[PDB]
């Protein structure tokens, strides 16, 4: 870190930051590992490190990701969440998980295909 | 004979139809033995289910061992010599009683049974049966009353009120577990009368287990993915403190 | 410190340069908070790579811990229990001979307590559960029928495989007990510190000759990859003594 965190300590001291002047680019196997991997660096440098986030969804829209990610800062998604309702004392850390992204701002792009015009815009 | 009496009794409260909704139950109702004269089954509307509770016998030295709590001591009694076996399978019962006390000691380890049926058949005489030869001596089979005990051991296991009643379900030699499936919070399965099940196979104890009915199907009861390949697995933890006989 | 502690702790296991590739993970150890205001970090040995695993938070019972088991009845020690025969003449004499041989990894061989029940198996056991206590180590009571019934069917999972293995004093109930599919759980445990080792800890109520009528048939030469780490780790032993049920 020199240097804004990127997130880990694995990942601070080799990057040194962060630093303002970067265009990164992350490519994985068969949706074996490019998503999270983003949707996991800036949301942690979104609710960890300073940053406020103009995210922008593709393929996978926002109202849908939210219920792929509400299960980072509060131990969830293995109880399970795509097989429904949740347990009195499993309403827990999700009111942490509701008050670690909600007093924050994270501006995202719902619209999946559309070229650089209407986002740079 | 009787459910006629019974259903112009409660006519007023008694819904109609469902006949082929409990097609399945009256099905097999009358495809059994069914009959009966410590205790009798009787019905009992319980908000939107109806019951079947035991009242003891009008017609009414192991009873200071046979005390059971949350049902009465009119209804425990009930020998092996007192036997006049009609039906099949309560015959195939005959090396499950006599050498199911002769090496039942503290800590002996391996498999008892899982009674089942419907409602009412001859069960509180087999679980009468089967343990008192136990008890006739210094072993081990303790009765207990599921669907009555629990009632309360929701709100109950607080300051030492029946905090101190409860942690006997885990400690005597041995220790039986009535009609589940009665009602039913969650935790009771991991809280109260699950937690007969981790504390019993991690010592070892030859524990009794009995049910309305059966363990191979008690898999797949309660979705009023998840308790499927999910609810089987309480049905194993029963699995292993017993070994399953019929009750045709 | 935390790395010199760890370095000889499984000294049998870690290579000088092991020590120098793991730098980061025993220098991030040693980093932070050694103690807790609910876990601990500990060093573990996985493979060639030294990891960091958290366990649980006189010194007698935070240092000692057990795995699918109650805690009422290990109340054991040794010396002052009332010996009765062969059955204990020489039991208080590998685990008392040794409370400063249990080398981090310098061969402390282990001992097998079969036999039959009330007796010996888990007690001598829960005998050091009790007296390996004091020194600050941690001392895990594993039991085997109560772990593989969520590990015959199927939360998470790769998980309790190794802070069941990055921890110094151990101690296994019943082997054998309830090719096969017991396989990620006690079968790799005996083939891995061939090149680590530590003091290793198993105990049933079949002996060596006796393990095997349980463990469960293949109709074959493929089995015996995990047996020939007892017969050099111990010796045939069991426990015929006294009733404590």
């Known amino acids: 870190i020199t240097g804004i965190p990127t997130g880990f300590t694995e990942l601070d001291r080799m990057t040194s930051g962060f630093q303002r002047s970067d265009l990164i680019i992350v490519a994985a196997r068969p949706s074996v590992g490019k998503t999270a991997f983003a949707l996991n660096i800036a949301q942690n440098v979104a609710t960890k490190t300073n940053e406020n986030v103009a995210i922008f969804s593709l393929e996978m829209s926002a109202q849908q990701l939210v219920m792929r990610m509400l299960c980072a800062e509060g131990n969830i998604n293995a109880q399970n969440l795509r097989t429904g309702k949740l347990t009195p004392e499993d309403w827990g850390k999700l009111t942490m998980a509701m008050g670690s992204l909600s007093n924050a701002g994270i501006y995202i792009d719902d619209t999946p295909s559309i070229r650089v015009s209407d986002i740079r815009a | ?248």
């Open chain 2, 1 to 248: 004979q009787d459910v006629q009496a019974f259903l112009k009794e409660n006519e007023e409260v008694i819904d109609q139809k469902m006949i082929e909704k409990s097609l399945n139950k009256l099905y097999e109702y009358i495809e059994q033995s069914k009959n009966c004269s410590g205790y009798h089954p009787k019905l009992v509307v319980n908000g939107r289910s109806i019951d079947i509770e035991y009242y003891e016998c009008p017609v009414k030295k192991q009873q200071s061992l046979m005390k059971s709590m949350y049902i009465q001591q009119d209804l425990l009694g009930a020998t092996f010599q007192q036997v006049d076996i009609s039906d099949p399978s309560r015959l195939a019962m005959f090396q499950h009683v006599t050498d199911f006390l002769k090496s039942y000691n503290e800590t002996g380890k391996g498999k008892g049974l899982y009674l089942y049926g419907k409602f009412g058949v001859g069960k509180t005489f087999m679980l009468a049966a089967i343990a008192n030869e136990l008890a006739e001596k210094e072993y081990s089979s303790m009765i207990v009353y599921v669907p009555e005990f629990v009632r309360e051991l929701k709100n109950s296991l607080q300051d030492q009120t029946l905090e101190e009643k409860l942690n006997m379900v885990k400690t005597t030699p041995v220790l039986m577990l009535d009609d589940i499936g009665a009602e039913s919070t969650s935790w009771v399965r991991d809280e109260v009368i699950g937690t007969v099940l981790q504390h019993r196979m991690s010592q070892q104890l030859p524990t009794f287990f009995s049910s309305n009915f059966s363990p191979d199907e008690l898999k797949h009861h309660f979705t009023y993915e998840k308790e499927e390949v999910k609810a089987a697995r309480l049905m194993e933890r029963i699995l292993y403190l017993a070994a399953p006989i019929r009750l045709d």
